[PDB]
Design a protein around this ligand. Structure first.
Ligand code: CLA
Ligand code: CLA
Ligand code: CLA
Ligand code: CLA
Ligand code: CLA
Ligand code: CLA
Ligand code: CLA
Ligand SMILES: CCCCCCCCCCCCCCCCCC(=O)OC[C@H](CO[C@@H]1O[C@H](CO)[C@H](O)[C@H](O)[C@H]1O)OC(=O)CCCCCCCCCCCCCCCCC
Ligand SMILES: CCCCCCCCCCCCCCCC(=O)OC[C@H](COP(=O)(O)OC[C@@H](O)CO)OC(=O)CCCCCCCCCCCCCCC
Ligand SMILES: CC1=C(/C=C/C(C)=C/C=C/C(C)=C/C=C/C=C(C)/C=C/C=C(C)/C=C/C2=C(C)CCCC2(C)C)C(C)(C)CCC1
Ligand SMILES: CC1=C(C/C=C(\C)CCC[C@H](C)CCC[C@H](C)CCCC(C)C)C(=O)c2ccccc2C1=O
Ligand code: SF4
Lengths: 146, 132, 743, 80, 73, 33, 131, 40
């Protein structure tokens, strides 16, 4: 039994079909991720990605930042996260400009200027909102005790 | 007609699909093991064989190895993304190391290397001394 | 007939001095004669590359066997000299009587040019250089007692050296074995694993049980060396032994019977360290070797030779194959039985790895009497064996690459483990690169973060045991396990294998020999840095082995060789792309890695272990425990370690430690000198030489062996050599001078 | 990309064309030398700049000179 | 690093990194427009000299100032 | 008050300005006129 | 076959410091600067290969290949001039009962294949075409 | 003998012998005339 085979049955491509690269688990997870899922509009793709990344970013800042022990530590953490989101958003904007150009036509192809702009917008809204949600959640932590 | 190989992570990448690609072909009289430039060992087939690579040098390197097996019928081509193909080597059917009547000289200067012009003389000209 | 037989050719090579007068005889190219200075250098660089001197494995093999005899002869002469110098130029006798006060010395300088200052007042009405190799302790453990005995072992050494040299000549010029003889791995392993190691251990146990143990007991008790009976007396009079160990009375009767328990008097599993000498109990050491001996002898009966029973390594290797590894270990046997370079790779790596282990195990569990309290010897040995190990490990990698470029054959390796490795090399290297970056950024970042924070007046934000803390929880756990082992997981033991894990403070002579070593945030930070350094070294070396034959950049690197300068200025630049160059770069990282390790040892010990303890419980460490809050920042290392602990070397002038000061300076000079070879190029030098030659010509004289500049590769080699010598030399003096004082 | 030029001092040893790793050089008929052959550089678009050719020339000073210049994917030997 | 280590080694390593980015899902979405390559021979020399020089001047600048001020000022 | 200027300008000069400048350079070098 | 397809590229040789388009062109006509991967059911690099359910590894799906039959044609087209020169010389040397260049070519290549024809001296050819 | 003499005539060997001799004589001079910073 061989669990490693040439990818796509092409013995000369620079890739291999390993259990990690091509397993039902990996295929399933990647197919349903917002980035590659089928049917999602550019805006929704960005939104989901943003919602996911914003929620986990408030943590590092809130618990290890300069004002962690201050009563306003969580608030400061939120502000810091928003700042990071802005930096990342600038990057997305700039990338789109260089990679796609100035006027597009295909449409509904994440890889076009219009679609990219919509994607970026979604990310910003989702990320900032997600960070806010974490702020509300971390304001009062449940002990789940009966 | 692909030789028997199990795959590698040293094969071609996107450039081969969007910029340009190469291919070598040869005929063998026996099935033998050769080492491929990408990395690893493969077994050639008894007859026609075709292999794809990303660089001309990689193809010509394999040709050197083939000559050791006494194979001198190799041909190298460049396939563009649209499907256009260019025959590259042996270009005129005769290996370059053998003078073939019908080939014209190119990039030849009729004087010793020391007779090239002085850099200052060609200043503000755009040409170089070796092209002057 | 027999699978294993002896085949030897008589009178293979005539002994004469003709070739001696024909430098370069070994090479076809060099033999023609010298025309430029390059010939001279090449002569020395291709001297021992037998593979390039001949095309027959038999011939190459024959040379290697004989050459090895030569090394053995040299080693024997070395040991002989040491014993002689310890018999005629040492204070062993005095030290033996008062080991705590007298300082070990076995080298004396002639009274020429004020160099006599180097002869220190070590003690015992003797003046000489304080040695740090640990000979005195070893001799005491063996039970030497006299200096006459040292003289005789010296004579034996000289004799042995001669025998080895004769053997080399004999087995190359008169009786040279054929290739078939060499290719008998199963037999060799059976003999070496049962005879060399098994019988060796058993023989040593005999000496320890009959000669060393008894004498050392008397010495520890207080008996004057002169009053202790001579070694032969113990061997003959069983009654004398019975007095010390009351079981010899029973004789060997208990042994032949199954009652091995009666020998518990001398064979014990006490553990811990002898309170009087501060070294492992010899009784335990005797049982150690006896047990190991049995194991080795049994293991030597695993491979088939000429009697049917046994294992054939080829079969074992080929059977072990799995779903993810193709043909598995098929093809490896042939490689290791037809390629010396491959064998050297594995053997050299393992040898170096062992040296590093010896360094760690020999300080935590001091093996010799009166060694732990001698801080100088302890530091010297740890650093020495740490270095030897690093070089050997890198060497293994080098020879591994030479194999890929010179002996690897695609035909014999189809879908085997080696082939599959070379088929996913990109993945392996890519991932390792990331691992190195991750570790490096996080590990060193901790230090930079702390430095910035302390400088900005924000000490509460540092990664320290007093702020954000990064405790080594896993290691702390293992320590507890080992501490509680005696009596539980190790029921028959009586104490911890090492007091480092935990226990009490063992003190000898008012000085601390061993103490529990604790692990905190600083230790976490340093350990992870060690990981980073080692990982990067592996990256460079492994990349060299995997991409030795080919690469996307240079598809035909194999034809170029293992040691080529480059392929050209094209492809954007192909400088230093050979496997040799990867080894070149790897050595620099090995230097860094080992340097940090030895520094960790020096500061940790002088801060949390070594020191003095009062009659009551008051422990004063040499540096005062500064490691915890000072080793967490780079400024701390520069100030509390290098700057402070270097006060000894810099202030050594006018003392017996003056030599170290001079060497410290000299080493710095050599290190800097090397940077001119590592930063410059052959072109500038060649042109300069041209102008210089003009002068000589203008005066009607010039060498026929035209002066030429060193090759690109040699330039790099010369640079690395001087760099390593200078760096290691500097630390050598720094450590030794500091240690002499602290001791 | 790079520029390779051949000079009249060539002797038609063919060593250069046998060393090129990318078939940039060829041997063409000529009458200036006893061998009756000279080297040419018809396909300089594939020169990587190795200078192996120069290393092989036997003439006092290289009859084949490679002058490095503009860089392209081919000249930079990029398989990616 | 720039002075003692030369291009060949680095170029090969960069090649492996390119492979990874092109084969890692999610990151594949983003791609470069300028092929990643190693620094040139002369460039590395310049970069190295600059690093050597800047460090040289900075370190002495601190010493000459802190030592003099810390003792006499 | 001018005294407040250090706390209003430094944030801009060391953070906002460098960012926009780098962005512009990238857009300039990634464009094919 | 467009023998100039490669030459017809966007590359513009510089004044000094450039070898030029050489013999087969200096750069591919197509631009390598294409986009990255796309969501399932979408395409990015123009005539790219659909990744199916694994769009992440779409670039590993080959779409550019060489047809052996087509390979023969490219060999003939790019070596047409050489063949012409060869046959012309054969014709110049008073061929025995010569007919037409093309006819001679067919006869001479009917035997000795085509590759062998390209690698044979006029003398050998005349010997071969003695009949 | 002749061949051995040639080996002893090799550059490396001769240098070592010569330098040993030179070093020795310098050392011996300092042994009998020590501590000199000038011709007295
Ligand atoms: C102090 C000198 C120095 C430093 C810092 C480095 C640094 C490095 N060398 Mg190197 N090297 C040096 C001297 C040095 N070298 C010398 C003298 C030689 C000659 C032998 C070499 C030869 C050499 C080779 C042959 C190799 C390296 C490799 C590496 C890299 C290891 C990966 C890593 O840890 O990344 C982390 C790098 C750091 C500098 C860590 C500190 C940076 C901070 C603390 C982390 C956070 C910063 C963040 C990323 C950005 C901050 C933003 C802001 C500052 C602008 C790293 C870039 C290896 C490599 O590239 O493989 C990965 C490798 O193969 N080196
Ligand atoms: C590289 C090592 C390192 C680390 C770990 C830290 C850590 C820290 N620094 Mg420090 N620092 C460092 C180097 C480092 N420093 C260096 C080299 C400098 C000099 C320039 C400084 C200068 C500095 C200053 C000036 C300050 C800090 C501060 C801080 C704290 C705030 C953390 C923060 O906001 O991060 C935010 C982190 C993130 C947004 C992301 C974290 C990375 C994520 C967790 C990785 C996740 C990977 C994931 C597991 C992958 C798998 C995913 C899969 C399972 C799906 C924190 C304790 C601040 C402080 O208060 O000090 C205590 C502060 O004011 N640092
Ligand atoms: C590892 C081996 C080793 C080392 C490093 C030393 C080192 C030392 N020994 Mg020692 N020794 C050794 C083994 C060793 N010994 C052995 C095995 C013995 C037993 C025979 C001795 C017996 C011994 C005595 C009896 C004495 C020393 C002394 C010394 C010290 C002065 C050395 C000396 O003579 O300088 C000066 C060097 C010379 C006089 C030799 C002259 C230099 C020669 C001519 C150069 C070589 C010529 C060259 C090879 C030509 C090549 C020809 C070709 C055929 C190869 C020095 C520290 C002396 C000492 O410490 O006194 C206080 C001293 O008296 N040793
Ligand atoms: C006096 C006795 C003697 C004589 C006359 C010869 C003569 C010869 N031997 Mg031989 N040999 C001898 C003893 C002798 N051997 C011994 C004892 C050994 C075992 C170690 C060998 C092992 C040996 C091998 C393995 C080889 C020879 C070879 C040769 C031939 C070439 C000579 C040569 O390479 O120059 C060498 C001249 C030297 C001066 C080299 C000496 C280097 C020293 C020992 C290094 C150590 C010095 C120092 C301690 C280390 C640095 C400090 C020549 C016929 C070679 C040959 O041609 O085989 C076909 C060959 O391959 N011999
Ligand atoms: C039991 C038999 C036996 C023993 C003891 C050895 C021992 C050794 N072999 Mg070995 N060998 C054997 C059988 C044996 N071999 C067989 C059967 C083969 C053929 C398959 C080989 C083929 C072989 C090769 C090809 C090589 C060795 C090498 C070595 C040496 C390794 C270096 C080392 O550990 O230094 C330890 C050094 C010592 C312990 C010094 C003493 C060495 C002498 C010779 C011990 C002899 C016994 C001694 C006289 C004690 C007698 C007991 C008496 C007092 C009661 C070592 C001396 C290597 C080497 O360097 O050889 C020169 C090497 O390259 N062996
Ligand atoms: C068991 C140990 C061992 C053995 C048997 C070999 C054997 C061999 N190695 Mg190897 N090697 C080893 C360990 C070993 N190596 C280690 C540990 C390393 C890592 C540093 C290397 C690195 C290495 C490289 C990089 C190369 C070899 C090569 C070779 C081959 C030819 C050696 C040669 O040129 O001779 C001639 C030997 C010399 C010129 C050495 C002379 C000593 C020099 C001058 C340094 C001296 C330093 C000195 C101690 C400092 C004194 C200071 C004082 C003056 C103040 C040979 C098969 C070469 C080869 O081509 O293989 C096929 C090659 O390229 N090896
Ligand atoms: C002149 C430039 C400059 C300035 C003004 C600052 C200012 C600051 N840095 Mg800093 N930094 C700088 C350069 C600078 N940095 C550089 C060059 C590095 C690299 C070595 C760092 C690395 C660094 C680290 C690693 C950390 C800081 C942190 C901080 C904050 C600590 C004070 C505080 O209350 O934190 C508490 C934080 C707040 C009260 C939140 C303030 C609101 C934020 C800043 C809004 C940001 C939005 C902004 C407009 C988005 C930019 C858009 C883009 C187009 C430019 C403070 C805002 C720490 C921090 O907490 O970061 C936020 C921290 O962990 N810095
Ligand atoms: C929210 C509506 C009412 C808020 C209010 O009444 O203020 C009243 C409160 C005032 O809460 C303040 O908290 C501080 C820190 O603890 C102080 O200590 C006091 O508690 C208090 O005065 O506001 C809030 O804190 C809650 C608002 C949380 C907002 C949710 C996140 C929404 C997304 C934000 C990102 C926007 C950017 C783009 C969005 C896309
Ligand atoms: C490590 C876990 C492990 O040992 O798995 C071992 C795994 C399975 O080995 P097999 O049992 O299939 O092959 C058996 C033979 O190799 C002989 O043991 O081999 C790999 O594929 C390693 C992949 C790279 C390692 C990833 C990091
Ligand atoms: C390890 C692992 C794993 C993973 C894990 C993870 C990675 C997780 C993550 C997670 C996450 C990361 C999550 C996130 C979340 C988020 C959220 C939940 C958000 C929300 C938001 C909201 C809800 C909203 C908001 C808003 C908006 C939108 C705007 C407006 C305003 C508001 C506020 C409204 C598992 C277990 C699988 C398995 C095993 C392996
Ligand atoms: C590390 C190293 C590299 C690799 C170093 C690299 C690739 C530097 C990469 C990081 C620098 C800081 C460039 C990163 C720039 C950012 C990506 C932002 C660029 C934005 C543009 C608009 C400028 C070499 O190429 C090299 C070549 C020859 C000899 C030695 C070496 C060498 O030692
Ligand atoms: S430099 Fe290299 S590629 Fe260019 S002609 Fe010379 S050998 Fe060929």
């Amino acid at each position: 039994a061989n669990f490693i085979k040439p990818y796509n049955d092409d013995p000369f491509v620079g890739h291999l079909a390993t259990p990690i690269t091509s397993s039902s688990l990996t295929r399933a997870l990647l197919k349903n991720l917002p980035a590659y899922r089928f049917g999602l509009t550019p805006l929704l793709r960005g939104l989901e990605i943003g919602l996911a990344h914003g929620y986990f970013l408030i943590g590092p800042f809130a618990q290890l930042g300069p004002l962690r022990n201050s009563d306003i530590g969580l608030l400061a953490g939120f502000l810091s996260t928003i700042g990071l989101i802005l930096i990342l958003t600038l990057g997305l904007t700039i990338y789109g400009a260089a990679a796609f150009g100035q006027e597009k036509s295909n449409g509904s192809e994440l890889q076009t200027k219009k679609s990219w702009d919509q994607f970026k917008g979604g990310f910003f809204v989702g990320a900032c909102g997600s960070a806010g949600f974490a702020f509300i959640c971390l304001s009062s932590i449940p002990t789940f005790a009966l | 007609p692909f030789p028997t190989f199990g795959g590698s992570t040293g094969g071609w990448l996107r450039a081969a699909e969007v910029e340009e690609k190469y291919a070598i072909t040869w005929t063998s009289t026996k099935e033998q093991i050769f080492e491929m430039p990408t990395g690893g060992a493969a077994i050639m087939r008894n007859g026609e064989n075709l292999l794809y690579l990303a660089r001309k040098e990689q193809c010509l390197a394999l040709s050197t190895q083939l000559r050791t097996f006494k194979i001198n019928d190799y041909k190298i081509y460049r396939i563009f993304p649209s499907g256009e193909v260019q025959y590259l080597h042996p270009k005129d059917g005769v290996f370059p190391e053998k003078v073939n009547p019908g080939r014209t000289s190119v990039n030849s200067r009729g004087f010793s290397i020391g007779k090239n012009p002085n850099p200052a003389s060609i200043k503000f000209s755009g040409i170089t001394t070796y092209e002057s | 007939s027999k699978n294993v037989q002896v085949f030897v050719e008589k009178d293979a090579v005539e002994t004469s001095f003709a070739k001696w007068a024909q430098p370069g005889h070994f090479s076809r190219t060099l033999a023609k004669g010298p025309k430029t200075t390059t010939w001279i250098w090449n002569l020395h660089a291709d001297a021992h590359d037998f593979d390039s001197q001949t095309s027959s494995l038999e011939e190459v093999s024959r040379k290697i066997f004989s050459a090895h005899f030569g090394q053995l002869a040299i080693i024997f002469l070395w040991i002989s000299g040491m014993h002689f110098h310890g018999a005629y130029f040492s204070n062993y006798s005095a030290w033996l009587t008062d080991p705590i006060s007298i300082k070990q010395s076995s080298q004396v300088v002639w009274p020429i040019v004020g160099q006599e200052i180097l002869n220190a007042d070590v003690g015992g009405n003797f003046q000489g250089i304080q040695t740090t190799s640990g000979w005195f302790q070893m001799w005491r453990a063996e039970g030497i007692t006299s200096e006459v005995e040292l003289y005789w072992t010296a004579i034996g050494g000289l004799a042995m050296s001669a025998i080895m040299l004769f053997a080399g000549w004999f087995h190359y010029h008169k009786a040279a074995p054929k290739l078939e003889w060499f290719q008998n791995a199963e037999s060799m392993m059976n003999h070496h694993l049962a005879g060399l190691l098994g019988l060796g251990c058993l023989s040593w146990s005999g000496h320890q049980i009959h000669i060393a143990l008894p004498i050392n007991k008397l010495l520890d008790a207080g008996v004057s060396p002169q009053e202790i009976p001579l070694p032969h007396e113990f061997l003959i009079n069983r009654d004398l032994m019975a007095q010390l160990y009351p079981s010899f009375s029973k004789g060997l009767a208990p042994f032949f019977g199954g009652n091995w328990g009666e020998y518990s008097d001398f064979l014990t599993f006490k553990g811990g360290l002898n309170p009087v000498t501060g070294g492992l109990w010899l009784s335990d050491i005797a049982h150690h070797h006896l047990a190991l001996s049995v194991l080795f002898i049994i293991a030597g009966h695993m491979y088939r030779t000429n009697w049917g029973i046994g294992h054939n390594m080829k079969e074992i290797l080929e059977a072990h194959k799995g779903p993810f590894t193709g043909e598995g270990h098929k093809g490896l046997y042939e490689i290791l039985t037809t390629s010396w370079h491959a064998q050297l790779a594995i053997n050299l790596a393992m040898m170096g790895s062992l040296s590093i282990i010896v360094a760690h195990h020999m300080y935590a569990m001091p093996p010799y009497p009166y060694l732990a309290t001698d801080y100088a010897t302890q530091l010297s040995l740890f650093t020495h064996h740490m270095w030897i190990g690093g070089f050997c490990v890198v060497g293994g990698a080098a020879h591994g690459a030479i194999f890929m470029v010179r002996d690897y054959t695609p035909a014999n390796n189809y879908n085997n483990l080696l082939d599959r490795v070379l088929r996913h090399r990109d993945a392996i290297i890519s991932h390792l690169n990331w691992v190195c970056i991750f570790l490096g950024c996080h590990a060193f970042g901790f230090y930079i973060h702390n430095d910035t924070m302390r400088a900005l007046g924000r000490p509460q934000d540092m990664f320290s045991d007093k702020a954000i803390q990064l405790q080594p929880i896993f290691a702390q756990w293992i320590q507890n396990i080992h501490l509680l082992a005696p009596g539980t997981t190790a029921p028959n033991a009586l104490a911890t294998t090492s007091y480092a894990f935990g226990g009490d403070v063992i003190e000898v002579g008012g000085k601390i020999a061993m103490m529990p070593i604790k692990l905190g945030t600083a230790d976490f930070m340093v350990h992870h840095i060690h990981a980073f350094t080692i990982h990067v070294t592996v990256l460079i070396l492994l990349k060299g082995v995997l991409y030795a034959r080919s690469s996307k950049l240079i598809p035909d690197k194999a034809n170029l060789g293992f040691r080529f300068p480059c392929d050209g200025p094209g492809r954007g630049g192909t400088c230093q792309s050979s496997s040799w160059d990867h080894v070149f770069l790897g050595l620099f990282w090995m230097y860094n890695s080992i340097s940090v390790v030895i520094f960790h040892f020096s500061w940790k010990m002088q801060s949390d272990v070594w020191g003095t303890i009062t009659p009551d419980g008051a422990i004063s460490h040499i540096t005062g425990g500064n490691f915890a809050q000072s080793s967490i920042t780079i400024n701390g290392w520069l100030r509390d370690f290098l700057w402070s602990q270097a006060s000894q070397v810099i202030q050594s002038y006018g003392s017996a430690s003056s030599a170290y000061g001079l060497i410290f300076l000299g080493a710095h000079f050599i290190w800097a000198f090397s940077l001119m070879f590592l930063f410059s190029g052959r072109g500038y030098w060649q042109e300069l030489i041209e102008s210089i030659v003009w002068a000589h010509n203008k005066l009607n004289f010039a060498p026929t062996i035209q002066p030429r500049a060193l090759s690109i590769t040699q330039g790099r080699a010369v640079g690395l050599a001087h760099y390593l010598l200078g760096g290691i030399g500097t630390t050598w003096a720094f450590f030794l001078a500091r240690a002499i004082s602290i001791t | 990309s790079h520029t390779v030029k051949i000079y009249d001092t060539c002797i038609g040893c063919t060593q250069c064309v046998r060393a090129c790793p990318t078939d940039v050089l060829e041997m063409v008929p000529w009458d200036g030398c006893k061998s009756g052959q000279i080297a040419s550089s018809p396909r300089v678009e594939d020169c990587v700049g190795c200078k192996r050719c120069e290393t092989a020339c036997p003439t006092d000073f290289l009859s084949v000179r490679v002058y490095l210049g503009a860089e392209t994917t081919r000249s930079l030997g990029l398989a990616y | 690093m720039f002075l003692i280590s030369w291009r060949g080694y680095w170029q090969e390593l960069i090649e492996t990194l390119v492979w990874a980015h092109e084969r890692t899902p999610l990151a594949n979405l983003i791609r470069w427009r300028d092929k990643p390559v190693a620094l040139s021979i002369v460039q590395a020399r310049l970069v190295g000299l600059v690093h050597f020089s800047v460090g040289y001047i900075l370190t002495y600048a601190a010493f000459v100032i802190a030592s003099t001020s810390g003792k006499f000022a | 008050a001018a005294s407040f200027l250090p706390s209003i300008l430094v944030p801009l000069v060391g953070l906002i300005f460098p960012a926009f400048s780098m962005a512009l350079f990238f857009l300039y070098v990634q464009t094919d006129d | 076959v467009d023998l100039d397809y490669g030459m017809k590229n966007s590359y513009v040789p510089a004044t000094g410091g450039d070898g030029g388009q050489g013999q087969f062109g200096a750069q591919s006509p197509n631009d390598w600067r294409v986009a990255g991967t796309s969501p399932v059911g979408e395409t990015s690099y123009a005539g790219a290969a659909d990744g199916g359910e694994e769009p992440w590894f779409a670039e590993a799906i080959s779409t550019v290949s060489l047809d052996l039959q087509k390979a023969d044609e490219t060999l003939k087209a790019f070596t047409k001039d050489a063949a012409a020169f060869k046959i012309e010389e054969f014709a110049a040397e008073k061929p025995y009962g010569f007919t037409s260049s093309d006819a001679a070519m067919e006869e001479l290549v009917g035997k000795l294949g085509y590759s062998k024809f390209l690698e044979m001296s006029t003398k050998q050819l005349m010997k071969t075409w003695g009949t | 003998m002749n061949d051995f003499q040639k080996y002893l005539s090799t550059a490396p060997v001769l240098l070592t012998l010569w330098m040993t001799f030179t070093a020795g004589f310098i050392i011996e001079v300092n042994r009998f005339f020590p501590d000199m910073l000038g011709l007295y």
